[PDB]
Write a protein that binds this ligand. Structure first.
Ligand SMILES: NC(=O)OC[C@@H]1N=C(N)N2CCC(O)(O)[C@@]23N=C(N)N[C@@H]13
Ligand SMILES: C[As](C)(=O)[O-]
Ligand SMILES: C[As](C)(=O)[O-]
Ligand SMILES: C[As](C)(=O)[O-]
Length: 818
């Protein structure tokens, strides 16, 4: 097997061939393909001439589009997970330097930093926090009483909980995004470290601002503007100056600067629709070196010879952060835009930093004087990912064998950023959007000029299969411009489309709502399913007696008078299926919050929960159908498991188990002769009962009171800015095509000939506008009992790539005392 790495320059080719000769990965052969620039390597990968390369984050979005169509696959984790056992990696890397007397970080058995660190060759010791950051002032020489280093095993929120406001924390001890004051009614949002965001203070009785989840990144890199102390201009006087940039497509040399110039209104630019960003920048600076730029004056200062001048390549001596520094040093520019990785103390004598507040500060003040944070780059390959396995196996084996991937005598930041500690395989789900995150993806999209201009009068409805797409096309065809259709492969894909600005609304079952609410989407309308009362549909806003929701109940046989909610442990159970809300989510959530987290084996006896491990206690009661009893078909999440679903779990209770976990309708749907099957033909609803949380039992008609939990209705989600419009247009369309629509003979919102339950559940009576209450949206939508039961009333109850991409990563301020 081969992995063709694409190099952009002679120096990168030399490092790549050094790795070819020195790094022995069995069964995988490294091959180096040479191109003249970053973009020519991207093209070679697109064409199948190379396999992988490393890209700046500022390039990921552009790389994901024509004419490249590349995706991130392998990268260093840009989150607080970069610090999980980081001591071990820094220890391996320091020992890899093979320098005599060099300081080697000391870790414990778990891989964490020892609170006291020592430089063995000098006898000096100091204290570090759990992140490996030096506590200020704790360095002592040998022979002197040492500073006492504290373990500080509790997080900041849990340590503030020791003090007696009341900062609600999650289970890991981190701050909750939403903070609510108990004495008053004011609620606000915090920033992972426990500091309030401006604009989130909401008085009681007002709709609270939805808080985004935050994650603290320890070691951050920043885009800075470096100048000489000999000059005297300020940031507001940049127009007409000569500049050196690391690269036209890099965040540390272009995109952060462009963002700041637009925000400060220093750059005359009418937007990407009227003028390219490069065109506007070429009239802002007079003669610059900006590798890759297509404006000639932005290449005049570059030093490369014929054919190499202004190339995105180390063949251009002014390319990259150190090349832009060389350009500034050799006086070919008045300012250099570069990443803070190229700052050093040796440069603090001659050079300083130009800050966007029109001041100048020392180099050590880069956290206080920068143009934004720079996320880590990433290895990319073709979207079709035919070589991802090979690239990953090669890189992981090379890291395990400690090959010199992240350093070279030929130069700095060749092939990879030298600051890379460890590369890890990304999930195949990760694309440019998930890698950059919501805000950054949108900013890159807007800078490129692909930003969708919103329409207040049209709703782009997202579909999850071809039949939904056909039904939506019908709807759009009779909608008079009010409805358009987009296509995705699953509800999460639609949620992503909405977050990216490619769609506007989608219906989501409860399973998907947590994620959706985590990412800042809100319910516009909800499916109303009460078939006995059309009032709230005919007269929108009229009072509601029952929304038609399903209630999750624990059904028993009345004869077995020994089953109570307290002695459920050990009894035989019946479930509709793993993942189902009434059949699985709510029962197991209640059990785990009342006993120890142990549903597999350590609670029930023999059960039949389809989809579980075939050789487990939760699969003994399951029986397949004798139509093909040769195959197992036991615990199959399908019709072949006779105990799968509502009728399945009821049959399980009938023939095997003691208690069934089902929606309240199952016993009524299957008893009283309403089921023509052989079983339940003589079954009565009065022959069963339901278990209550207080240990009591109640008749099957008491499901509204004696229930395990309520279940929220399916919700149509959209972005906040679209709520009104969506609520309006749906309403209009309902009055046309709902169950009593004026033109119901032309189209039906809640039925179709193309299939069943497309876009909405066919049993939907209508869609009712969500009435937002002055509370947290998680509680407001789920109901406080459901929220508290299945998510602990916490924003940290689930992890996913989407939730990560919706999590804001941010950096500290300056000092590291404690
Ligand atoms: N009729 C009814 O059942 O309420 C419908 C609507 N839908 C929810 N999922 N909710 C969560 C709890 C809740 O109060 O029932 C509600 N919260 C608001 N703001 N309106 C409700
Ligand atoms: C806690 As000690 C004496 O190993 O620094
Ligand atoms: C053994 As010592 C004085 O370097 O902690
Ligand atoms: C400025 As480019 C997308 O050709 O690297």
């Amino acid at each position: 097997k081969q992995v063709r790495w694409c190099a952009i320059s002679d120096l990168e080719q030399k490092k790549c061939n050094d790795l070819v000769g020195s790094c022995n990965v069995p069964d995988i052969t490294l091959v180096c393909v040479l191109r003249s620039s970053t973009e020519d390597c991207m093209t070679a990968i697109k064409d199948g001439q190379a396999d992988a390369m490393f890209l700046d984050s500022g390039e990921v979005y552009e790389a994901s589009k024509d004419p490249y169509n590349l995706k991130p696959i392998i990268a260093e984790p840009y989150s607080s997970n970069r610090d999980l056992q980081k001591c071990l990696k820094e220890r391996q890397q320091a020992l890899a330097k093979k320098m005599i007397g060099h300081y080697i970080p000391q870790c414990d058995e778990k891989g964490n930093y020892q609170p006291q660190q020592c430089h063995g060759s000098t006898g000096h010791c100091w204290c570090v926090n759990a992140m490996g950051e030096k506590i200020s002032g704790t360095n002592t020489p040998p022979g002197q009483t040492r500073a006492t280093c504290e373990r500080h095993e509790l997080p900041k929120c849990l340590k503030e909980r020791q003090v007696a406001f009341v900062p609600q924390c999650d289970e890991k001890g981190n701050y909750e995004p939403q903070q609510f004051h108990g004495s008053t009614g004011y609620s606000w949002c915090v920033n992972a470290i426990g500091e309030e965001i401006a604009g989130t203070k909401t008085p009681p009785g007002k709709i609270p601002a939805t808080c985004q989840k935050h994650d603290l990144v320890t070691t951050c890199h920043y885009a800075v503007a470096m100048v000489k102390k000999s000059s005297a201009f300020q940031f507001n006087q940049l127009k007409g100056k000569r500049s050196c940039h690391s690269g036209v497509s890099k965040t540390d040399g272009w995109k952060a600067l462009v963002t700041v110039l637009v925000e400060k209104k220093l750059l005359s630019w009418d937007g990407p629709a009227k003028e390219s960003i490069q065109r506007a920048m070429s009239k802002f600076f007079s003669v610059s070196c900006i590798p890759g730029a297509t404006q000639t004056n932005l290449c005049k200062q570059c030093k490369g010879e014929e054919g190499k001048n202004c190339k995105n390549s180390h063949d251009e001596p002014y390319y990259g952060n150190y090349g832009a520094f060389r350009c500034l040093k050799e006086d070919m520019g008045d300012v250099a835009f570069l990443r803070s990785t190229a700052l050093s103390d040796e440069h603090s004598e001659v050079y300083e930093l130009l800050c966007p507040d029109n001041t100048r500060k020392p180099l050590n003040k880069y956290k206080e004087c920068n143009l934004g944070t720079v996320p880590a780059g990433t290895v990319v390959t073709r979207k079709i990912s035919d070589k991802t396995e090979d690239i990953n196996n090669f890189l992981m084996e090379a890291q395990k064998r400690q090959c010199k991937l992240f350093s070279s005598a030929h130069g700095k930041d060749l092939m990879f950023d030298d600051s890379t500690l460890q590369l890890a395989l990304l999930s195949s789900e990760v694309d440019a959007f998930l890698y950059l995150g919501v805000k950054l993806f949108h900013a890159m999209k807007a800078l490129t000029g692909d930003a969708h201009l919103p329409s207040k009068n049209k709703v782009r409805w997202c579909t999850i299969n071809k039949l939904e797409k056909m039904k939506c096309d019908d709807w759009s065809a009779v909608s008079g411009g009010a409805i358009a259709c987009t296509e995705a492969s699953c509800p999460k894909g639609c949620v992503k489309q909405i977050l990216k600005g490619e769609a506007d609304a989608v219906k989501l079952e409860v399973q998907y709502m947590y994620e959706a609410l985590m990412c800042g989407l809100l319910p516009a309308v909800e499916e109303y399913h009460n078939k006995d009362d059309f009032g709230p549909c005919k007269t929108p806003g009229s009072p509601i007696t029952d929304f038609g929701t399903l209630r999750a109940v624990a059904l028993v046989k009345k004869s077995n008078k020994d089953i109570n909610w307290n002695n459920i442990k050990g009894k035989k159970s019946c479930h509709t299926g793993v993942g189902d809300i009434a059949g699985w989510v709510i029962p197991v959530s209640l059990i785990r919050r009342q006993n120890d987290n142990s549903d597999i084996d350590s609670f029930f006896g023999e059960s039949c929960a389809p989809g579980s491990d075939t050789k487990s206690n939760l699969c003994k009661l399951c029986i397949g159908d004798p139509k093909n009893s040769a195959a197992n078909t036991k615990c199959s999440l399908s019709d072949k498991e006779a105990y799968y679903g509502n009728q399945g779990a009821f049959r399980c209770l009938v023939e095997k188990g003691d208690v069934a976990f089902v929606p309240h309708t199952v016993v009524f749907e299957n008893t009283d002769g309403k089921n023509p099957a052989v079983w339940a033909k003589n079954l009565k609803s009065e022959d069963f009962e339901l278990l209550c949380l207080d240990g009591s039992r109640a008749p099957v008609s008491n499901y509204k009171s004696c229930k395990l939990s309520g279940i929220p209705p399916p919700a149509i989600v959209t972005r906040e800015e679209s709520i009104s419009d969506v609520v309006r247009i749906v309403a209009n369309q309902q009055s046309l095509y709902g169950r009593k629509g004026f033109e119901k003979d032309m189209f039906q919102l809640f039925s179709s000939n193309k299939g069943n339950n497309l876009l909405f559940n066919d049993n939907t009576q209508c869609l009712i506008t969500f009435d937002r209450q002055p509370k947290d949206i998680m509680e407001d939508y789920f109901g406080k009992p459901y929220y508290t039961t299945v998510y602990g009333a916490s924003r940290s109850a689930m992890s996913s790539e989407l939730i990560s991409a919706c999590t804001i990563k941010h950096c500290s301020n300056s000092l590291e005392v404690l």
